Amino acid sequence: STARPRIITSKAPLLPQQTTPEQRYWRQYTSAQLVKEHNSVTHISFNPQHPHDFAVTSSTRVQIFSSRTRQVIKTFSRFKDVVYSASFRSDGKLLCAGDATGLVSVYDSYNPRTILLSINASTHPTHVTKFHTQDNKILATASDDRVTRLWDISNAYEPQLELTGATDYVRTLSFIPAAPHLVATGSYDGLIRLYDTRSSGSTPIYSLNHDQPVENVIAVSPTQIVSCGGNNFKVWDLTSNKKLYERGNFNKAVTCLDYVENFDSPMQSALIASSLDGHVKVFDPLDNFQVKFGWKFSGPVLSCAVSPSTAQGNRHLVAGLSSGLLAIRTKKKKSNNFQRMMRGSEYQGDQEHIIHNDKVRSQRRMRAFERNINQFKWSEALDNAFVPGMAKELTLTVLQELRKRGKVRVALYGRDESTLEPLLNWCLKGIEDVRSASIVADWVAVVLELYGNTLESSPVLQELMIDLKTKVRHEIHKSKEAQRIEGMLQLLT
Amino acid sequence: MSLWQLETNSQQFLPRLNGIIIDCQVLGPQGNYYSLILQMTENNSNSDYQFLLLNASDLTSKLSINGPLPVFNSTIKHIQQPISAMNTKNSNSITSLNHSKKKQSRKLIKSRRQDFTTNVEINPINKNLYFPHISAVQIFDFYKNEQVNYQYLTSGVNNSMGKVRFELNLQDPIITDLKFTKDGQWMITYEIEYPPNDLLSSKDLTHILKFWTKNDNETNWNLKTKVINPHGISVPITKILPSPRSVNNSQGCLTADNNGGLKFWSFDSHESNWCLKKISLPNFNHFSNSVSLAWSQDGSLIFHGFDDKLQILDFDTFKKFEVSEFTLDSEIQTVKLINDTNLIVATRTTLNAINLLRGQVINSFDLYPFVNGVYKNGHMDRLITCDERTGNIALVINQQLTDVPTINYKSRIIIFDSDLSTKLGNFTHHEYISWIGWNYDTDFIFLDIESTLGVVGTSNSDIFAEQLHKL
Amino acid sequence: PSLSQPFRLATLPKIASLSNFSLQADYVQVADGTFNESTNNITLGISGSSISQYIINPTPKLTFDYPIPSTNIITACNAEKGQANKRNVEIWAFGLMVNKGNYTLNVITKALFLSQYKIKAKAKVMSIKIDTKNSLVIAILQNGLIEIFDFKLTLLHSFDISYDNLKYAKWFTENGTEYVFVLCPLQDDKVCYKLLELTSSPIKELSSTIIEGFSFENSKLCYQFGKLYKLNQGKIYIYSLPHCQLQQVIEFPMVDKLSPGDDLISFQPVSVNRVLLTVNNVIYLLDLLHCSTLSQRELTHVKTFQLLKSAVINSEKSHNSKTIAIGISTKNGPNPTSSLEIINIDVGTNTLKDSLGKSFQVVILKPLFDDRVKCNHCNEVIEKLSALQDNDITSFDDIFFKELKIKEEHYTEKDRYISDPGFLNKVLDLIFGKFSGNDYPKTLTFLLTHPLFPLSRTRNLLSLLRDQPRLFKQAIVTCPNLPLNELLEELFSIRNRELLLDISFRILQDFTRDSIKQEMKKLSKLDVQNFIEFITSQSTQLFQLLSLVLDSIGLFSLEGALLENLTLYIDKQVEIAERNTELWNLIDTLPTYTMEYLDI
Amino acid sequence: GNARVTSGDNFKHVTTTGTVTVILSQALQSNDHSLLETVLNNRDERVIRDTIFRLKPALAVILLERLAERIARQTHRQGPLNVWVKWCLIIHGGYLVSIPNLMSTLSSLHSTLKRRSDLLPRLLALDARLDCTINKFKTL
RNA sequence: UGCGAAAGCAGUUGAAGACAAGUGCUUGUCGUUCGUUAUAAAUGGCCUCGUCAAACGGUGGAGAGAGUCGCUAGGUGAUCGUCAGAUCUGCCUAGUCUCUAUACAGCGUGUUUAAUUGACAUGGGUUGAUGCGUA
């Protein structure tokens, strides 16, 4: 003997743009909070360490948000003029920020009162202040002075090195992983300049031409750097020193760009790119950087970031808007005598010679309609189909299942107008759908062939068929029209 | 099977047996085992008995025994359906039995269509033998001469319930064609689902195609993709040809209609599911079930034989080559190439060996005396088979009669070398041979209507030791 | 596959040794290293003139020339680029004779003359190899000695194959290792095959075999991809390394007709299983696996063409199907002039597609069984039919039907023996010659029903039968493979409605829309305009043909005035179709107080 | 289980003011469904022809794919969106002809249109049956 | 039943014997024969081994639900009415717009391309069955 097969849910041929595994994951960033900041939120960064709090730079302050609470826990308001960065250290202990006055300060993260080191990098604004990922002790600051000085924490009086050669504002700085000596800076000149700090420096090893002002440069991988500028973002390979791919799906100018790798999503790697059009879209590097999901916000997006790979908790997507609105989207992640009484349940036979396993796995509970078919309750199975809050697909199967069993007339004998109307009501609606049109055709044919006499004496049944005649007549026009379209579409080829 | 407890008139059941129960018995000094005989009435062509020995302890099959279970095109010998309450397709009523027996004898003797050819497949990786039973596949290992599996490859009311009375008139979906790709990791199946009677949609058969996969260690095929109504609506898939090793490392196939359309399907890793890679338009209003497909080993060209005309189509363009038109005297039943050079074409009146290299016929053998209207279109393809190294084979079955035709038959096998210059061997068997195909070794396997798979191919201690064993 | 016109590289000097056009190939040597798929250079050694290096593209030009005295014959030449102690250098090695008395081995290094060296070799340097990685020059000698030299020609090692009179030597690389094999003639048409591996001794002998039935004097030899090709007496013998076992023998009939002595043949490989063969001024591109002639070209402006070397493609690994071959072309005239000619070669895809119908090699029903079971002379007939007088129908029919024992005037399955195409074609010829005008024999009606009616006679067949309606109708219904062009023209030219419907059904059954649609474009706008007008004045095949017209006409050609009329007619037809469709579905488909009178 | 169902017709892998072309051209380029939806929301047929008339032929093709989808997922939108599809073919017919491949890029149209066309014979059969009974009790 | 495509194109469904029932006659039947290619209906429906809760990975979706008198395009009603229009601040259908645990369906997580855990003594007895919740 064999177990009873489960009734197989009906699946019609696939339509365009099914839900993709990538779309399903990113759709889980459901809960949305909208916070209002004083000015445009320019930069957003995530602490690389647990609990992975993220810092938002708005107006003349920095705010750190708790991951679990999604609310402000620390505020840095010592800054007099506008602020321009909040990058953490790799260890996550230290937070650095830039100022329009040009002063760069380093604070103990989570300790706003204490100020470790204060550096007057330049008299011009210092927009970028990023810690070096490989080496903790060295800081790089890019300023409107167009020199990206590379400071050292121990020695704050003079830069360890001063890189130059940028003929316009430098607002983008990136450190290539696995290549601590290399440093990459992108200016509004449209050139991405690479420098070798091991050498004397101050002259770029080679330049990469973007042709538009470069708003942010991110080193996706040890050999690949993605740079987003103008109305498109291009990925370059240093070993070949040429662009591998380019995507210009955006409408406004790309501003910010962030990358996350080896996280529990189906996509192993993700690239989130702000657009300044209200769009931030996810690109999958493994698939030649094709779009896989997108969000829309009220206004232009100036900053975007995601929780690091090792979030160890609920993930977060953070979007920054020039209006000052901050958008957060989150993927949430007896008696001792009685135990000495029955103490053998925990054991799993780890020491025993022979292990015998015969328990049958617990199968999911069967719905009401499936039970009726299994017990040959034909008339009741039709009733369970036509109940409030029944999934349309699930309703289609029991109709097909009865037809497959050869029990269509048998299901409709013991009925009157009172218990026939629920079927007609559904048929009034299902006739529209392409998938259920044919099944509606069969059942309505039988009920007419089986209840012609009852139809005459019952008025309510008549109005149902008048309305049904109108809808089927409506479908004939649509089905005819589709044929006409196919006729023309054939002419073109 | 119902155990009636007569003391209280209660009962216990063992439902969803493989077939209807012809016989029951209690076999043991204590009734330890129940012996049952099952019929599997789905196959009307032949009577398929299965003997089952159940342990009365937990009602689990202690020993299930059944031979090969082919499904022949028509009924054979004196096979009569069992007796039921009403006369149906799968059963006979009280009165219909004698008249049906007489009619069957008259059909076997007088009529001229005597096609009993059954479809069968061989698994390349395992060399198991796959029988397309109605709505299922029976996997049978002929080396060990025992069944290995019985899998339902279709939807429908197959083992959900026991059909009784008018339900027994229902027809379950019929697995028409079954084939494997060369690598053996993909299984392609073609189904025809028949609608129930007395409905508006009682004349629209549904054509289904399915792609299955399994790892070698596993024993159950898992359905990977499903195509509903390929080639359009209500258009059968007459022929399926798995692709050669050169084209997409044997992860592709061709499907061919009775409207002569060709559809080339392939497995795309990116989608991870089979896709319709190429198409040809089946628009000409010429209908014929006699289509044959051959594919060159390199894969560049495809031979499409439709009705009496054969086409050489480029694979890359999937269109006529740029002579590609070859006319034949009658409709082609089979097209194959014994080797890359020679193409053997079998029409309803003869068979001909052609040189593609010369475009000339080498040898022509007359088949009309033996095959005139005995076989329906396409079945000569399963009667004819070819090795890829040595040569091909023709199979010819004759009704033997002495003093009006008799039931018993005589079959004759002929080995042929490539281009049919010579007969390497000539053999005769004493029974109707349903199918002959080429095992991937040099030998060929053929199946007989008696369900017999034959093959054609190239001191005091010593006394003390005995006593101790006795004790 | 295709053959380009040769283009000139250089004009050979007028030397007595080069005057012998038969032996001219022996006196020109092609460097193996510089001539390959990707190289744009050719280093050539001309006996008595120089060893010269030429750039092929964009234009042929001389890049370097090393003069040689006129009395010397270049036996072997090879050039390779590499690094030597590190400066990028080009190493040239060449071996010459002065009257057989002395043997000169010369190595030249050039900066990309850095050094020039000369030694006296013991026997004829048959072939030369340069190993740039190890800075070695390897020379094989006709006396069987293989001597390894540095770039300064200091002898490092010497290996003797123990056999003398070496005639052929060739290198090949397999899995990164260098291998060489040699052919040494023996008596009684016996040959010693040896295979050597280049790696204490740097030379290792892998295989040694003696081959019988292998002649040299009339044999041309070349190697490609582990297969040695020997051409002799029009038969190409295929030997397989490492044992050089004869695998296949390919007969080439076009060479069998060649008178021995006057016809000059050259034979070189160009790709896997493909070879280049010259016969005087004719080049053939041959596929040996399928035995087909992929391409043929004749050089009318030259007396002969001799292949010297060909850049061979490993097309199994290369997507490139285009390569080059270099040869000597000899002009016609009292003062023939020899020149070095380069030809571009498109090998193709190495698939059966290329070889279909191009084989270079040039039926009666047979019972299945020679000998109690239920059963379910072409020349003579032609002569009898041929001997008949002109316009005699009765005897012509009587001979055909009686001699063939035909019972019906249309083909049946019982006439299969008559299906031989040769017999049918001749009878058609007799019908035309014997009979002209209004009266044709009944055999023509039989043949028109024959499924194997020759395609050669299909053309204009409708035109011949226009005069007699019955023959015209018979052709339309059953004549096989009638042209679509003639059918389509008759469709729009004939006014008979029955013929129009008959032609329409035949066209659709036997042709696809993409096939029909292109031809419908060709038709004039006026005829299609008339056809539509007939419509506005089984029918579905006539309607569905209209849709094909409306497609072929296109959007632009259609003019508004007619389009309105076609609209009203179709709108009427659509309404009728809906009306009939409904009819088809139609065909398929107690009171409290009652007053009655009692019957009594 | 989780197998993919499919059909054999899925050839996927083989003048006036008020025009909304500017919004459309941006919307199609950026795949902005919300911006696209506002463009499709207009229903004045005169506005429709003007838009597709000035729309670049390259952007016309991707418009057909987008409209083909919205019809396929939402049947009730078939009516109003059909007007867009009809004008796209008429205006850009010349360009659509001169495209290397159409089945791969217009597969959504053929799939959607084929499904609706296939239903026509059956829906007519019910219409005859309904018309029968509806006539019968009306006269009685 | 033959042929064919799946549509359909042609063609059949007879005679004898015996039994029962009702009245030699009428009807119905056949574990009876010959010849031709040739409704049903004896109240009669499929077992047990383990359930519940919470997750995770794919495959589908008409999404599952709630608002917005914010728009677009329609259909349509009660009363009065000088036929132009009035109040019901009318209703309904569809789309669009906002939102949420994708909230909806299904397969698996004994090894698989991927993906799990936890609870319970899976018992016996007594009360309530006018059960419990709700209008």
Swiss-Prot record, chain A:
GO biological process: one example: maturation of SSU-rRNA from tricistronic rRNA transcript (SSU-rRNA, 5.8S rRNA, LSU-rRNA)
Keywords: Nucleus, Repeat, Ribonucleoprotein, Ribosome biogenesis, rRNA processing, Transcription, WD repeat
WD repeat feature ranges: 36-77, 78-117, 123-161, 165-205, 209-246, 249-293
Cellular compartments annotated: Nucleus, Nucleolus
Name of one Pfam family that matches: UTP15_C
Role, per record: Involved in nucleolar processing of pre-18S ribosomal RNA. Required for optimal pre-ribosomal RNA transcription by RNA polymerase I together with a subset of U3 proteins required for transcription (t-UTPs).
Assembly behavior: Interacts with snoRNA U3. Interacts with MPP10. Component of the ribosomal small subunit (SSU) processome composed of at least 40 protein subunits and snoRNA U3. In the absence of snoRNA3, forms a complex with other t-UTPs. This complex can associate with pre-18S ribosomal RNAs.
PANTHER family, sorted: U3 SMALL NUCLEOLAR RNA-ASSOCIATED PROTEIN 15 HOMOLOG, UTP15 U3 SMALL NUCLEOLAR RNA-ASSOCIATED PROTEIN 15 FAMILY MEMBER
UniProt name for this protein: U3 small nucleolar RNA-associated protein 15
Taxonomic lineage: Eukaryota, Fungi, Dikarya, Ascomycota, Saccharomycotina
Primary gene name: UTP15
From Swiss-Prot, chain B:
Tagged with keyword Repeat: yes
Main localization of the protein described in the UniProt heading: nucleus
Subunit description: Interacts with snoRNA U3. Interacts with MPP10. Component of the ribosomal small subunit (SSU) processome composed of at least 40 protein subunits and snoRNA U3. In the absence of snoRNA3, forms a complex with other t-UTPs. This complex can associate with pre-18S ribosomal RNAs.
Function (record text): Involved in nucleolar processing of pre-18S ribosomal RNA. Required for optimal pre-ribosomal RNA transcription by RNA polymerase I together with a subset of U3 proteins required for transcription (t-UTPs).
Natural source organism: Saccharomyces cerevisiae (strain ATCC 204508 / S288c)
Keyword annotations of the record: Nucleus, Repeat, Ribonucleoprotein, Ribosome biogenesis, rRNA processing, Transcription, WD repeat
One MF annotation (Gene Ontology) recorded for this entry: U3 snoRNA binding
Compartment list: Nucleus, Nucleolus
Protein name: NET1-associated nuclear protein 1
Residues of the full protein shown: 321 to 829 of 896
Swiss-Prot/TrEMBL WD repeat ranges: 170-222, 232-275, 285-322
An example Gene Ontology CC term for this record: 90S preribosome
Source domain of life: Eukaryota
Additional observations: Present with 6560 molecules/cell in log phase SD medium.
From Swiss-Prot, chain C:
InterPro entries registered for this protein in UniProt: Utp8_b-prop, Utp8_C
Cystine connections: none
GO cellular component: 90S preribosome; nucleolus; rDNA heterochromatin; small-subunit processome; t-UTP complex
Compartment list: Nucleus, Nucleolus
Gene Ontology terms describing biological process: maturation of SSU-rRNA; maturation of SSU-rRNA from tricistronic rRNA transcript (SSU-rRNA, 5.8S rRNA, LSU-rRNA); positive regulation of transcription by RNA polymerase I; tRNA export from nucleus
Residue ranges that the Swiss-Prot or TrEMBL entry lists as coiled coil: none
Domain of life: Eukaryota
Keywords: Nucleus, Phosphoprotein, Ribonucleoprotein, Ribosome biogenesis, rRNA processing, Transcription
Single GO molecular function: tRNA binding
Major site of localization recorded for this protein: nucleus
Assembly and oligomerization: Interacts with snoRNA U3. Interacts with MPP10 and UTP25. Component of the ribosomal small subunit (SSU) processome composed of at least 40 protein subunits and snoRNA U3. In the absence of snoRNA3, forms a complex with other t-UTPs. This complex can associate with pre-18S ribosomal RNAs.
Function of the molecule: Involved in nucleolar processing of pre-18S ribosomal RNA. Also has a role in nuclear tRNA export. It acts between the steps of tRNA maturation/aminoacylation and its subsequent translocation out of the nucleus. Required for optimal pre-ribosomal RNA transcription by RNA polymerase I together with a subset of U3 proteins required for transcription (t-UTPs).
Comment field (misc): Present with 16800 molecules/cell in log phase SD medium.
Protein name: U3 small nucleolar RNA-associated protein 8
Gene coding for it: UTP8
From Swiss-Prot, chain D:
Primary location group: nucleus
Top-level taxonomic group: Eukaryota
Record's keyword terms, sorted: Nucleus, Repeat, Ribonucleoprotein, Ribosome biogenesis, rRNA processing, Transcription, WD repeat
Gene Ontology cellular component annotations, sorted alphabetically: nucleolus; nucleoplasm; rDNA heterochromatin; small-subunit processome; t-UTP complex
Claim: Transcription is one of the keywords in the record: yes
UniProt-annotated location(s): Nucleus, Nucleolus
Keyword rRNA processing among UniProt keywords: yes
Ranges: WD repeats: 54-94
Record-level GO BP terms: maturation of SSU-rRNA; maturation of SSU-rRNA from tricistronic rRNA transcript (SSU-rRNA, 5.8S rRNA, LSU-rRNA); positive regulation of transcription by RNA polymerase I
Cystine crosslinks: none
Assembly and binders: Interacts with snoRNA U3. Interacts with MPP10. Component of the ribosomal small subunit (SSU) processome composed of at least 40 protein subunits and snoRNA U3. In the absence of snoRNA3, forms a complex with other t-UTPs. This complex can associate with pre-18S ribosomal RNAs.
Note: Present with 33100 molecules/cell in log phase SD medium.
Protein function: Involved in nucleolar processing of pre-18S ribosomal RNA. Required for optimal pre-ribosomal RNA transcription by RNA polymerase I together with a subset of U3 proteins required for transcription (t-UTPs).
Protein family: Belongs to the UTP5 family.
Name this protein carries in UniProt: U3 small nucleolar RNA-associated protein 5
Naturally occurring in which organism (per UniProt): Saccharomyces cerevisiae (strain ATCC 204508 / S288c)
